[PDB]
Structure formats: C-alpha cells, structure tokens
C-alpha cells in the first residue's frame, strides 16, 4: 500500500494492455532483478506483499529498488447495485508489460539473492524471470 | 503421507523418485513421505 | 440403366479367419468388408451380398496398448444405477466370443439390413469350428500396395 499523492483524473480508462515494453527493459540499478514476461495489472497490495517477502528473507543487508509505481485508479462499483454513472476508485494499479523489470536487489551473496527474488515471483500474478545486470 | 500438488525435498537424504506414473519423495524420516508432485 | 441384382444372383460362398496374433480392429474392419459384400465387383447397398465369415481363436486376439485393463465396454439395464462395466481382460476370460463380435457389430451400418448382416458372422473361442462340411477358404488379410 503505496499510493499517488494527487492524481489529476480520479476516473480513467483501462490501462492499455497489449504490446512489448520499450523500457526500462534491462537492469539499471543493482546486481539482481526480476523481469516480467507477461501482461498484468500489479496492484499496490502485490508490490508491498512482494517487498516484505524480500526484506524478511534477506534480513538486514542489501537494498531493494522498485521500478514500478501504481499511479492509476481502476474503478469498482457496489456489489448490491444494478448495472448508472461510473463507480468509485478502489484499487491502485501499475500497467506491466513483457520486457519490463519490476524489482531489484543489491545483496552480495548469490544464493540468498536468487531465492529472495523467488519469494517475490510467487506473490505476483505474472509468470516471471530472474535476471542479472551482466 | 502428505499428498498436495507440490512435493519438494526437505532432507538432503530425501530422494524424489516416481512410482507407477506418480511422483513421490522418500526420506529416512517416516514424516517426509509425499505424493502426486 | 445400371446393374442391380435380380434374385437369385447371390454367389455368396464362405470365408474362415484365424485371429491368433493379429490385432483387433484390422481383423474386425476386414471382416466387416466381407460381411457387407463390398469386395464384390457387383455391390448394391439395398441388397446384402455379404459372404459368410468364421472367426477362430477369438480369445487369442492381441489387443495391444494397455487396453486389457483400462477399456471398460459398458452396458445399461433400464433401471436406475444399472450401469455395468466389464474390463476386456475380464470379459475375454468369461466370454471370448464377445470381444471380436462386439467390435465387428459396431462397424456394421446399424439399420434393418445391418441386423441381417449379423447372421453371416460366426465367432469361436477354440481352434475348431463345426462348418467343415461347406469347405470355407482361409482368408488371410491383405493390404493392396499403392
């Protein structure tokens, strides 16, 4: 649960799904990251769930970047109601496309780095790959 | 034994074989026996 | 116009298959061509010109795969919960006549004429048959090279 400060239009269209990512497709910051190989709407729940899964498994050392930010409303209506207007902004959702690097990890060990990212793969909807800066 | 779609080893002794078209892991411990991995 | 049989034109005659090692299906389909009379130069669909077939060693048929456990061959009586199922290996031990028969009946046309075709078939478990008076010719099953 991290959210944008002041969004200009609180009710938007669906983020444009299909297409390959132009950038950032490669690792820019740290030694190990994870690159999405699929289209998904990564909710701010799923980022924070994946973020702590690294931080618990890594313990004290290293450093975690997040190239994702949610930014976008995605509307829901009440479950009671009949099918009037547009509903209220419920989620907060980053549009992810194949190519794009999501998370990043600076931890000096090889094994502790890779399996800590492997925790973050299972808590995202995407079917993902572990990448390296080299 | 523990069923479930996952198996995975726990002991290094745990063997992960497959019998009669079905995946299982056997360890010295009676506890680490699994199926349909 | 064309030729149609105006009776009697049926030469008929007999055949005798031995199964032994040959697989089910290609026995049964090759039997069913003889049973319709479709090998004949003269063939009209409305009449039956179907030659007699005696299948022998109908327990020996090599079914292949793992069908002798897993193929079930269902019946239903009429009553609720009347669905019986009977493994081919179990069915062949009890009734070795049935397995070659129930294959061959499934390949025939399924109509009023197609039931008159079923009289021409006979099917025996052992090597012997009691139609040795009529002198049937042994029909080995043949592919024509294309």
């Amino acid at each position: 649960m991290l959210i944008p400060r002041k969004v200009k239009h609180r009710k938007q269209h669906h983020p444009e799904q299909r297409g390959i990512a132009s950038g950032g497709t490669s690792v820019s910051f740290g030694d190990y990251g994870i690159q999405a190989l699929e289209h998904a709407y990564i909710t701010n729940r799923q980022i924070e769930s994946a973020r702590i899964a690294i931080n618990r498994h890594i313990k004290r050392g290293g450093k975690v970047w997040i190239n994702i930010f949610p930014d976008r409303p995605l509307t829901k209506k009440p479950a009671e109601t009949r099918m009037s207007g547009k509903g209220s902004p419920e989620w907060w959702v980053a549009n992810v496309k194949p190519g794009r690097v999501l998370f990043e990890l600076s931890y000096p060990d090889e094994k502790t780095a890779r399996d800590a990212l492997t925790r973050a793969i299972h808590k995202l909807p995407i079917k993902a790959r572990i990448v390296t800066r080299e | 034994m523990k069923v479930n779609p996952s198996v995975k080893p726990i002991c290094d002794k745990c063997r992960v074989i497959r019998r009669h078209g079905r995946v299982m892991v056997i360890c010295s411990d009676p506890r680490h026996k699994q199926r349909q991995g | 116009p064309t030729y149609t049989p105006k009776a009697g034109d049926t030469t008929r005659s007999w055949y005798v298959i031995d199964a032994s090692d040959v697989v089910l299906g290609r026995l049964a389909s090759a039997a069913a061509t003889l049973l319709r009379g479709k090998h004949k130069p003269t063939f009209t669909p409305n009449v039956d010109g179907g030659d007699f077939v005696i299948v022998i060693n109908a327990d020996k048929i090599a079914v292949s795969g793992d069908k002798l456990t897993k193929k079930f061959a269902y019946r239903h009586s009429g009553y609720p919960g009347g669905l019986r199922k009977r493994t081919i290996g179990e069915l062949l031990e009890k009734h070795p006549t049935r397995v070659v028969e129930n294959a061959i009946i499934g390949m025939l046309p399924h109509n009023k004429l197609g039931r008159q075709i079923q009289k021409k078939l006979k099917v025996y478990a052992g090597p012997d048959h009691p139609h040795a008076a009529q002198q049937p010719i042994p029909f080995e099953i043949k592919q024509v090279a294309q």
Binding site: - | - | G78, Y79, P80
Partner: protein, 212 residues
Amino acid sequence: RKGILGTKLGMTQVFDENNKVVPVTVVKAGPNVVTRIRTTERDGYSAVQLAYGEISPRKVIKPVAGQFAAAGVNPRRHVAELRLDDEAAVAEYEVGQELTAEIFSDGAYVDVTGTSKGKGFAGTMKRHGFRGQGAAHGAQAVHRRPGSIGGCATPGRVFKGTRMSGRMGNDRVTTQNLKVHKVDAENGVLLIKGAIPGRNGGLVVVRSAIKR
C-alpha cells in the same frame, strides 16, 4: 446335499427336550421314485428328477406316460429336479430308487421351497409396506394412495422398478435353514420348526441347507 419332495400338512406345537414350546410345521414327504438322472455328458449338468404323489393311470397324458414307462415306474402327480453340485453326487442314485423321509436325521437344517399364497391384486399398502396419507386434517381422498411417483421435467418419466400395485403372491420363495425338530420314520412325516411357505396341501421341496 440330499433332498425330498412333499406336501404341507399344516401346523401344530410340540414340547422340547428342555420343556420349551417349539412351533412345528408338519410336512409329509412320501416315497419318491427317482425317474431320470440328468448326467454331465449329455445334458451339461448333474441333477436328479423326483416323482411324487399317487395319480390314476387314465388321467396321465400319453407323452407323460411314456416317460414313466421308460423309467419302469408307476406314473405320479408331480415331478421336479434336485440340482446338485459337482458330478460326484449322482453316482449314488439308480432309476427306480424309492427314497423316503427317514434320511434327514434329527437336528438338521433345510431350505424347504414352496409356492406362496396368492393375495390377489393388493396395491401399495399391503404389497410394499408403504405409509398412506393422514386420515384427518384436510386429507381429500388419499388415505391409502401411493402419492408421488417421480420428479419433474427432468427426467420426465417414471423409472423401471418403481413400486406401485399389482398381483401379489404365488412367488416361489424360500425359508432358509429352519431346523428339523423330529424325523418320524413311520407315517413318513417331518416336524420342521417354523413356517414353511404355501397353502395346506401344496407341493414343497425340502433339501439340506446350502448355508447351514
């Protein structure tokens, strides 16, 4: 596995060796002639055909008379088979052997087959042991009626073996076990414990029990 045809002679009660009452159904198995012995060579099974009961020669049909003439036996009322297991048991019968009720030996168990009493088109309540609808609290003309007989638009039919209404009894039935209290050798009667199917004077096939 021994057997005997006879008649149901009606019931009485007889007191035990240890002073209890046992209710006993009296049958009289008279002297039965084995007419024909079915053999595993020709027939494909083993069985014994038993003749029972006195009939006048003029009553007998010429087809039926010639079968008894082949046996060398005076014709009889009823005839029936005892099917018996294996080939070995028919070895000790000869055509014209007149067996009697003495064979059974006190304290045996039997099957005692016989056709039941006809009850003559009983519906629902008597036949199957249904419950009827209530006798009061509204109930319009349903007091012994079957009620529903099926679901609705699926399946849209009544199933086979639904329990309705029709002619009851004259079923062949069997008692099973049913201890023989006393073989009486003179007179030719067996006191068998408990009820045996059928009317008084109906044909009855007593044989030793397969379950025992």
